[PDB]
Amino acid sequence: SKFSFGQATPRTLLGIIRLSQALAKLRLADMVDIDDVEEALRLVRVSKESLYQ
Amino acid sequence: FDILCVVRDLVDEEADERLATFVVDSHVSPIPQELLMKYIHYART
Amino acid sequence: RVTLQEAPGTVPPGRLPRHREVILLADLVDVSKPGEEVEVTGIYKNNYDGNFATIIEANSIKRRETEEEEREFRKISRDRGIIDKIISSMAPSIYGHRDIKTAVACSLFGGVPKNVNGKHSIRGDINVLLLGDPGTAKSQILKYVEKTAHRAVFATGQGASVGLTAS
Amino acid sequence: KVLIDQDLAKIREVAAREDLYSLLARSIAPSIYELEDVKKGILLQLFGGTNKTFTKGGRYRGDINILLCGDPSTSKSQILQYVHKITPRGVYTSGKGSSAVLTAYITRDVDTKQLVLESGALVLSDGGVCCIDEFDKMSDSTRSVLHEVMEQQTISIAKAGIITTLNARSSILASANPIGSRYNPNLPVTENIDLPPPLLSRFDLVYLVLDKVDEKNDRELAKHLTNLYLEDKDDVLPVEFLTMYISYAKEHIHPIITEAAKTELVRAYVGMRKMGDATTRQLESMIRLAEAHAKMKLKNVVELEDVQEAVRLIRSAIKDYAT
Amino acid sequence: VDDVTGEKVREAFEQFLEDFSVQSTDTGEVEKVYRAQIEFMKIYDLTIYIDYQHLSMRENGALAMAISEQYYRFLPFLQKGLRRVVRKYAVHRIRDIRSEKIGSLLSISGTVTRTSEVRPELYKASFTCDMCRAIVDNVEQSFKYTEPTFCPNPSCENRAFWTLNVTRSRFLDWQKVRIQENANEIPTGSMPRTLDVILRGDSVERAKPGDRCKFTGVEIVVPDTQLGLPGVKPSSTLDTSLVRDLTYKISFLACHVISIGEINELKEMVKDEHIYDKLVRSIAPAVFGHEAVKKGILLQMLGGVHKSTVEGIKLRGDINICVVGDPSTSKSQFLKYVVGFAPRSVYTSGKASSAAGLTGGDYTIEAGALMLADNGICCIDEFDKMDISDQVAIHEAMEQQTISIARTSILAAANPVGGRYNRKLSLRGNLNMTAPIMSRFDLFFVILDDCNEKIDTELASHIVDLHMKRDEAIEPPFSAEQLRRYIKYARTFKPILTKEARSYLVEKYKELRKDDAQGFSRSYRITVRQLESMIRLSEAIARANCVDEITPSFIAEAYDLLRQSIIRVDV
């Protein structure tokens, strides 16, 4: 019952895939790359646990 | 409240005898109930 | 004209009641009152034509349960030992308990408020509390009270009914 | 709009397959690669029991009701919707949107301006399997009506409009979530589930979904789900063979439970009764589950075999009740 | 034209009914079954009961396929032929209704909803003008309220009109219910359909909301929101200033509606002696185990005496049995057999029911699963799931036998707190109830089981052999129907006890209280009610024995019944 949750659902992965999909849509080129999904992981690790300060 | 009638429960042998025998009589001088009903209605008015 | 509907007491259990019309005439004007049962002696007719509904005109209203009758009554009421006899004639089902039976017999018999001419009225009722015990037929006594007395509505234990507060 | 038989030999070809118990169950839900016992129970839910009525009294249907619950990240709801898809007359309900008045849909008419009495959701479940979500989150009226269904399989209508009962049989199947986010060990199963214990043991079989700390199941999980997510979509996958097989096997298959099985029944029953401190409820469970498997694979008689795993399916849950 | 066709059909059917009705021999009815039907009617003075097959017997359907198309055409012909016989001697659904079905015969089943009142009819307009001879009587009666006829033959004209005589006529009563379609035939995603049906004459009040019935084949259409429907609406511009227009709907009418959907054996059952013991094992063959609970159930099946007194208070005649047992014992099967066999039975483990579940000016209070068990047993499970006010209402129904704003016996099924009974603990700490409702209860029947391979295998073998369709025909010594016939004859006994052992019952009560006066450690402050219940138990045992004037042996049996009934509680 700490700041972090217990389990990770597969919908988390479904959401981050759709998120990186939209990130590729902002490139307007269908150029799904490593940074495309890396930005999707960045808004997850930064979206959560922003209560450090 | 005005009156407080309280009954008691204690082991009486003869009261149980009378109770059971009158119960038997109940499954078998006082005013009949028609006269007492005319009594209270005629009296209270 | 008085509307009358079926009595919820002798309804077959679960079905719904129906209606019928009752019309009053001269000495019977406004005899019933809402919240009652009734037994009427009616003649049955129907309407003529509309441009058949039946209407019951009623003759004798009796509610559901003489000179020599009060003077022969007074020939007996003159005695002395009617005090213990009232309790002895009050409730023959459970035999004893003369004191509480005499107090209950005194309760329904009434009191007088006696309003002073112009000044004030005090109180006119007798208040009876009877602290029971499981294992007592004390309820049977009050059922005798309801059948012998005039107007008695049994007020339930907790919200199951009528509710004594008009609203 | 559209009140332009012969396939039976292929049915018997697949019926003559030795690996039918894995081919049929494995081809049901390709989304999860586990719960093979649960998938077998789901398969038996349509092949449930022999509707045995006695000479006087009796009238024992073949209804079985199994709830599964546990930890999240299992896509249990997608499983239940898939069950709703398999059921030809499936009803998928949920929690907190029901009342006693899934039944008794009495309402007012519009054009005729009257009060017309209507049938509920479980009446739509008359014959088949019902689906309920968040079973722990029902109301006071909801989940209490289910006693009549689990016991009498009837509906009692008795108010001023219509005083008349009727039966509506189904296969009730539901899911719910426990109190704690993680099911902890060394704790009672009846405790960590918001269910009434008389109804809890009244159910046929109870399942437990737990979280695992492995890596291998997470790799096959993520490769499987990545392939299911990618491209937006060596096994024989009959989509409709089983669908017509169950319909054909519903009337044309009558499994008989004769004498030879009773020896093994009492033989297993004494060892089952040895655990105590097991009631007749478990005996009725095993006899309705053994004949359920006997309805599978087109067997009109009972066999001394198929009873070992029939008992073991119940015993797997029972060994999970140690803590 | 139609007069000739209907007259030939009429004479052939009159000959048909005048011929044989049923082919059966002297063993049974021989001939003239409809003639015996009319003679049966002469005995009762009601109607006609006709079969579709019997009308289909003589002309091999030639006459049946004459009537089954235009019956409306052949109503007066059918009445006139029957009238001359009198003076001579004294399944489809709603979707199967078309316009070709008018006048024809089709049977429809369904769901009865919204019964209606009783209203009389007319069909006897005696309406004539102001002229002296105002004594006509229009032979019209159609679906029109046109009482006065135009052409009389008095000096009065057609415009001269007066009211219809409501005193010289023959009327009939009828109701108008609207049947609902079954829910077992509607497809998925489909709402129910409605249809009107008219119930005419003698067969009135036979309806019941929520029933499956078979109907008369005839059908009508009644003349008439159906404005701007659209549709070509007809008008009544006859051929030659400017009548109304019309748009109708399909209705239904009927005349015959069915509502479907031994002295020597009793002598054999009463001249015997072992019949009590025979009735012991002949109650619950589905249950394999003990039998004393079946004893209390059997005695519950026979009512008490409930005799009258003077106008103050009459004595009641009912018994109350409440059984609490160990969880997972297939106790619901016990309950299910009780409700499955006993008449006037309503089963409920009521928790989903409202607070009223345990109990322009419609005032309809609902029934409640408890109040509707008049002259029946209302068995309720899981008392712990209910509150204390309900328990008070239980005491209400159990004492006044009324509810003021229920003439029932209540069966119970309770459970332990810890699930099991602690033998070192007392019984009062395990019922989970208060003192007066416990004292109101007559019998308890505590049942607890252990593990033993002999009893578990024998009872399990008996129940599994019941599920074995082979040998599931175990025979109780009595059948269920001769048993119920025996109960019906058994309630007609009315025992008058005229025995001196009434005093023996009194000292028996004294010794019943002196021993109970000793040892208040393990659980009772014995109630007067216990004694009165002992009276009624000794009444009904001899009632089960077909014995009037209850013997002291029966008293001792009821005494030992309550004696070991309380010792089983006494631990």
C with E: how many residue pairs have Cβ under 8 Å apart? 92
Question: What residues in E contact C52, CB-CB < 8 Å?
Answer: 119-122, 171
Q: Give the H or E element holding residue E531.
A: helix E528-544
Residues E187 and D3 sit within 8 Å (Cβ to Cβ): yes
Contact between chains at D229 and A14 (C-beta distance less than 8 A): yes
Tell me which residue of C105, C143, C9 sits closest to E399, measured CA to CA: C143
Distance in angstroms (rounded) separating the CA atoms of residues E378 and E531: 24
Distance in angstroms (rounded) separating the CA atoms of residues C107 and C111: 8
**Where chain A is broken, by preceding residue (C–N > 2.5 Å)?**
none
Alpha helix locations (H) across C1-137? 67-77, 82-88, 98-109
E524 shares contact with chain B (CB less than 8 Å): no
Tell me which residue of C71, C67, C74, C130 sits closest to C97, measured CA to CA: C130
Q: Which of D198, D262, D274 sits opposite E327 (nearest CB)?
A: D198
**Where chain C is broken, by preceding residue (C–N > 2.5 Å)?**
51, 65, 161
* Tally of residues, chain E: 571
Taking 3-state DSSP, the helix, strand and coil percentages for chain C, each rounded to the nearest 5, stand at: 25, 20, 55
Distance in angstroms (rounded) separating the CA atoms of residues D22 and D17: 10
Contact between chains at D73 and A8 (C-beta distance less than 8 A): yes
Question: What residues in D contact A14, CB-CB < 8 Å?
Answer: 229
A6 shares contact with chain D (CB less than 8 Å): yes
Residues D302 and D291 sit within 8 Å (Cβ to Cβ): yes
DSSP letter at E373 equals: -
Chain D nearest-CA distance from E252, in A, is 17
CA distances (Å), E291 to each of D9, D224, E252, E441, in order?
A: 54, 60, 55, 20
Contacts with C32 (C-beta within 8 Å, 6 or more apart), sequence order: C2, C38, C61
CA distances (Å), D275 to each of D263, D268, E451, E519, in order?
A: 20, 12, 10, 38
C-beta neighbour count of B3 within 10 angstroms: 14
E352 shares contact with chain D (CB less than 8 Å): yes
Q: Is C81 exposed, middle or buried (0-12, 13-18, 19+ CB in 10 A)?
A: exposed
Distance in angstroms (rounded) separating the CA atoms of residues E140 and E85: 25
Chain E nearest-CA distance from B29, in A, is 15
Contact between chains at C13 and E374 (C-beta distance less than 8 A): yes
CA distances (Å), E63 to each of B35, D189, E73, E369, E564, in order?
A: 75, 73, 14, 52, 74
Q: Which of B5, B35, B41 sits opposite C130 (nearest CB)?
A: B5
Distance in angstroms (rounded) separating the CA atoms of residues D188 and D204: 18
Which residues of chain D from 72 to 111 reach within 8 Å of chain E, CB to CB? 89, 100, 109, 111
The tokens of E8 are what? 């030939």
Residue set of the binding site of E for ATP: 325-332
Angle between helices D260-274 and D280-295 (to 10 degrees): 140
The tokens of E203 are what? 């067969």
Contact between chains at C15 and D160 (C-beta distance less than 8 A): yes
Distance in angstroms (rounded) separating the CA atoms of residues E508 and D236: 81
CA distances (Å), D12 to each of D5, D7, D16, D276, D298, in order?
A: 11, 9, 6, 44, 9
Contact between chains at B26 and E315 (C-beta distance less than 8 A): yes
**From the candidates C106, C125, C130, which should be mutated to test the interface with B, based on the most B CB atoms within 10 A?**
C130
Residues E381 and E332 sit within 8 Å (Cβ to Cβ): yes
Distance in angstroms (rounded) separating the CA atoms of residues E1 and E14: 20
DSSP letter at D196 equals: -
Question: What residues in E contact D281, CB-CB < 8 Å?
Answer: 328, 330
Residues E299 and E540 sit within 8 Å (Cβ to Cβ): yes
C-beta neighbour count of E107 within 10 angstroms: 15
Q: Which amino acid is at E96?
A: D
Contact between chains at E513 and B23 (C-beta distance less than 8 A): no
Residues E439 and C135 sit within 8 Å (Cβ to Cβ): yes
Distance in angstroms (rounded) separating the CA atoms of residues D185 and D206: 16
C with D: how many residue pairs have Cβ under 8 Å apart? 8
B28 shares contact with chain C (CB less than 8 Å): no
Alpha-carbon dihedral C49, C52, C58, C59, rounded to 10 degrees: 70
Q: How would DSSP label each residue in E8-68?
A: HHHHHHHHHHHS-S----SSS--S-HHHHHHHHHHHH-------HHHHTTSSTTTTHHHHT
Contact between chains at E312 and C48 (C-beta distance less than 8 A): no
Closest chain D CA to residue E95: D3
E128 shares contact with chain C (CB less than 8 Å): no
With an 8 Å Cβ cutoff, the interface of chain D facing chain C consists of: 158-161, 163
- Map residue C42 onto helix, strand or coil: strand
Residues C134 and E527 sit within 8 Å (Cβ to Cβ): yes
Distance in angstroms (rounded) separating the CA atoms of residues E378 and E412: 9
**From the candidates B1, B7, B34, which should be mutated to test the interface with C, based on the most C CB atoms within 10 A?**
B7
Q: Which of D3, D197, D276 sits opposite E451 (nearest CB)?
A: D276
Contacts with D282 (C-beta within 8 Å, 6 or more apart), sequence order: D272, D314
Residues D83 and D90 sit within 8 Å (Cβ to Cβ): yes
The tokens of D136 are what? 């722990």
Q: Which part of chain E has CATH 3.30.1640.10?
A: 1-90
First and final C-alpha spacing in chain B: 25
Residue D148 half-sphere exposure toward CB, CA atoms < 13 A: 25
Distance in angstroms (rounded) separating the CA atoms of residues E316 and E306: 4
Residues D117 and D210 sit within 8 Å (Cβ to Cβ): no
Chain E nearest-CA distance from C8, in A, is 8
Is the C-alpha dihedral spanning E48, E49, E52, E53 positive or negative? negative
Closest chain B CA to residue C98: B5
- Residues pairing with C61 in the sheet: C40
First and final C-alpha spacing in chain E: 93
Residues E416 and E294 sit within 8 Å (Cβ to Cβ): no
Chain C nearest-CA distance from D156, in A, is 13
The tokens of C89 are what? 């004639």
Which residues of chain E from 520 to 549 reach within 8 Å of chain D, CB to CB? none
Distance in angstroms (rounded) separating the CA atoms of residues D44 and D31: 20
* Tally of residues, chain C: 167
Residues E338 and E297 sit within 8 Å (Cβ to Cβ): yes
Q: Report the phi/psi class of residue C114: left, alpha or beta, with left for phi > 0 and alpha for psi in -120 to 50.
A: left
Question: What residues in E contact B19, CB-CB < 8 Å?
Answer: 528
C48 shares contact with chain B (CB less than 8 Å): no
**Where chain E is broken, by preceding residue (C–N > 2.5 Å)?**
46, 90, 224, 240, 242, 261, 359, 405, 523
Contact between chains at D73 and A9 (C-beta distance less than 8 A): yes
Contact between chains at E531 and B20 (C-beta distance less than 8 A): yes
Tell me which residue of D86, B24, A26 sits closest to E504, measured CA to CA: B24
Question: What residues in D contact C15, CB-CB < 8 Å?
Answer: 160, 163
DSSP letter at B32 equals: P
Tell me which residue of E4, E101, E20 sits closest to E55, measured CA to CA: E20
Residues E20 and E91 sit within 8 Å (Cβ to Cβ): no
Distance in angstroms (rounded) separating the CA atoms of residues D285 and E459: 17
DSSP letter at E314 equals: P
Q: Report the phi/psi class of residue E210: left, alpha or beta, with left for phi > 0 and alpha for psi in -120 to 50.
A: left
CA distances (Å), E1 to each of E7, E88, E186, E433, in order?
A: 10, 27, 43, 82
Q: Does domain E1-90 have CATH number 3.10.180.10?
A: no
List b or e across C115-146, with b for residues whose CB sees 16 or more CB atoms inside 10 angstroms.
Answer: eeeeeeeeeeebebebeeebbbebebbebbbe
Longest C-alpha distance within chain A, in Å? 43
Residue set of the binding site of D for ATP: 70-77
Tell me which residue of D262, D291, D268 sits closest to E470, measured CA to CA: D262
Closest chain C CA to residue B6: C131
Distance in angstroms (rounded) separating the CA atoms of residues C49 and E145: 8
Residues E467 and D287 sit within 8 Å (Cβ to Cβ): yes
Angle between helices E263-270 and E480-490 (to 10 degrees): 80
Distance in angstroms (rounded) separating the CA atoms of residues D100 and D90: 20
Contact between chains at B36 and C97 (C-beta distance less than 8 A): no
Question: What residues in E contact B21, CB-CB < 8 Å?
Answer: 503, 506
- Rounded to the nearest 5°, which phi and psi values hold at A48? -85, 155
Q: Which part of chain E has CATH 2.40.50.140?
A: 91-119+173-224+247-261
Contacts with E479 (C-beta within 8 Å, 6 or more apart), sequence order: none
**From the candidates E524, E528, E549, E550, which should be mutated to test the interface with B, based on the most B CB atoms within 10 A?**
E528
Contact between chains at A13 and D229 (C-beta distance less than 8 A): yes
Residues E177 and E116 sit within 8 Å (Cβ to Cβ): yes
Residues C156 and E396 sit within 8 Å (Cβ to Cβ): yes
User: Cis bond leading into E230, ω under 30°?
Assistant: yes
Residue D4 half-sphere exposure toward CB, CA atoms < 13 A: 1
- Rounded to the nearest 5°, which phi and psi values hold at C86? -60, -45
Alpha-carbon dihedral D162, D166, D169, D174, rounded to 10 degrees: 30
Residue E446 half-sphere exposure toward CB, CA atoms < 13 A: 18
B9 shares contact with chain C (CB less than 8 Å): yes
B5 shares contact with chain C (CB less than 8 Å): yes
Q: Give the H or E element holding residue D217.
A: helix D216-229
Contact between chains at C150 and B41 (C-beta distance less than 8 A): yes
What is the CATH code for E91-119+173-224+247-261?
Answer: 2.40.50.140
Closest chain C CA to residue D159: C14
C-beta neighbour count of E429 within 10 angstroms: 12
List chains touching C (3+ CB pairs under 8 A).
Answer: B, D, E
Q: Helix count (H) and strand count (E) of chain C? A: 4, 5
Contact between chains at A7 and D181 (C-beta distance less than 8 A): yes
Superfamily of domain E262-571 in CATH is P-loop containing nucleotide triphosphate hydrolases (3.40.50.300)
Tell me which residue of D23, D132, D35, D128 sits closest to D86, measured CA to CA: D128
How far is residue E203 CA from its own chain's centroid?
Answer: 17
List chains touching E (3+ CB pairs under 8 A).
Answer: B, C, D
